[PDB]
Swiss-Prot record, chain A:
Cell membrane found in the keyword field: no
Protein name: DNA-directed RNA polymerase subunit omega
Organism classification: Bacteria, Bacillati, Actinomycetota, Actinomycetes, Mycobacteriales
Reactions catalysed according to its record: RNA(n) + a ribonucleoside 5'-triphosphate = RNA(n+1) + diphosphate
E.C. code: 2.7.7.6
Family membership: Belongs to the RNA polymerase subunit omega family.
GO MF term set: bacterial-type RNA polymerase core enzyme binding; DNA binding; DNA-directed RNA polymerase activity
Gene Ontology CC annotation, any one: peptidoglycan-based cell wall
Function: Promotes RNA polymerase assembly. Latches the N- and C-terminal regions of the beta' subunit thereby facilitating its interaction with the beta and alpha subunits.
Alphabetically ordered keywords of this record: DNA-directed RNA polymerase, Nucleotidyltransferase, Transcription, Transferase
Gene designation: rpoZ
One record GO biological process: DNA-templated transcription initiation
Subunit text: The RNAP catalytic core consists of 2 alpha, 1 beta, 1 beta' and 1 omega subunit. When a sigma factor is associated with the core the holoenzyme is formed, which can initiate transcription.
Provenance organism: Mycobacterium tuberculosis (strain ATCC 25618 / H37Rv)
Curated annotation (Swiss-Prot), chain B:
Function: DNA-dependent RNA polymerase catalyzes the transcription of DNA into RNA using the four ribonucleoside triphosphates as substrates.
Name of the featured protein: DNA-directed RNA polymerase subunit beta
Subunit field text: The RNAP catalytic core consists of 2 alpha, 1 beta, 1 beta' and 1 omega subunit. When a sigma factor is associated with the core the holoenzyme is formed, which can initiate transcription. Interacts with CarD, TRCF (Mfd) and RbpA.
Source species: Mycobacterium tuberculosis (strain ATCC 25618 / H37Rv)
UniProt record similarity statement: Belongs to the RNA polymerase beta chain family.
Whole-protein residues included: 1082 to 1130 of 1178
UniProtKB/Swiss-Prot annotation, chain C:
Family in the record: Belongs to the RNA polymerase beta' chain family.
Intrachain disulfide bonds: none
Record's function text: DNA-dependent RNA polymerase catalyzes the transcription of DNA into RNA using the four ribonucleoside triphosphates as substrates.
Protein name in UniProt: DNA-directed RNA polymerase subunit beta'
Bilayer-spanning residue ranges: none
Source organism superkingdom: Bacteria
Whole-protein residues included: 295 to 343 of 1316
Length: 83, 49, 49
């Protein structure tokens, strides 16, 4: 219910907090997925597709972390809490 | 936390850390976790004296 | 005295650590050795001691 933002602030922060328990968990919850995405890109040439690539279709040469944050907003990831 | 860890370990002291992170950035590999800063190892080898 | 003795007992060590027979020396870099224009020894006196 507001003007669509532009830049790195999309998606917004409050929307994400509705999914994750706390902002401190979200940073890792997204960084690990970004790491998995980067690993998948590294093995794109040849290897096992165990680290499934991006779920949401990426843009034109977007950083993996942006993809992770934009797909987390879509509620497509599940995680376990501390240990 | 991780930002402070990098600022204190991976960009100031750790030699092998600097070499490995530079090579990883040159390639597409993820940045390896930092190591033991030279300051801590020097402090050890000095306090053991 | 009881506090000190109980600390000794709990430590699992022996007091014999208070009499040394072999002092160690730090590596050479920690006491860097410097050569002046005339090659004089003016580095840390650790070498002197």
């Amino acid at each position: 219910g507001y003007d669509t933002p532009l830049g790195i602030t999309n998606p917004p922060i409050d929307e994400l907090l509705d999914r994750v328990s706390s902002k401190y968990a979200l940073v890792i919850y997204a960084a690990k997925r970004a790491r998995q995405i980067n690993d998948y890109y590294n093995q794109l040439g040849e290897g096992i597709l165990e680290y499934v690539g991006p779920l949401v279709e990426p843009g034109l040469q977007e950083k993996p972390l942006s993809i992770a944050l934009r797909e987390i907003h879509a509620d497509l990831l599940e995680h376990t809490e501390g240990e | 936390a991780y930002t402070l860890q990098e600022l204190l370990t991976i960009k100031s002291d750790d030699t092998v850390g600097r070499v490995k992170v530079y090579e990883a950035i040159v390639k597409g590999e993820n940045i390896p976790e930092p190591g033991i800063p030279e300051s801590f190892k020097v402090l050890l080898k000095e306090l053991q004296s | 005295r009881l506090k000190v003795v109980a600390a000794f007992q709990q430590s699992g060590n022996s007091p014999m650590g208070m009499v040394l027979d072999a002092v160690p020396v730090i590596p050479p870099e920690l006491r860097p050795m410097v050569q002046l224009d005339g090659g004089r020894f003016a580095t840390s006196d650790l070498n002197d001691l």
